[PDB]
Amino acid sequence: LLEFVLDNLYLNRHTGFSQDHTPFTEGANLRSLPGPDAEKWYSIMYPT
């Protein structure tokens, strides 16, 4: 348990968001990671 706490001692740097251009989600601003293949993260974040 202590090690899990140790491993989670991080600061989250503020990210950026992009509006959804599709009707699958309500045009939400998705946190956008730099670099490609974030869409797998986008799909996981918004299964809808």
Partner: protein, 48 residues
């Protein structure tokens, strides 16, 4: 959609529920149109 009542007889005309940002972007296009219409070389309602 706001608490204040306003007559909209073309709600039959198709529209989704736009986010405040979506309305703002449409509004920005209206503003650019107004500036070009008045041939405005200066920024107009930019804070708005």
């Amino acid at each position: 959609e706001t608490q204040y009542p306003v007559d909209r007889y073309l709600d039959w005309i198709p529209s989704l529920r736009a986010s405040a940002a979506t309305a703002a972007t449409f509004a920005e296009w209206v503003n650019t149109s107004m500036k070009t219409a008045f041939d405005l070389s200066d920024m107009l309602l930019e804070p708005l």
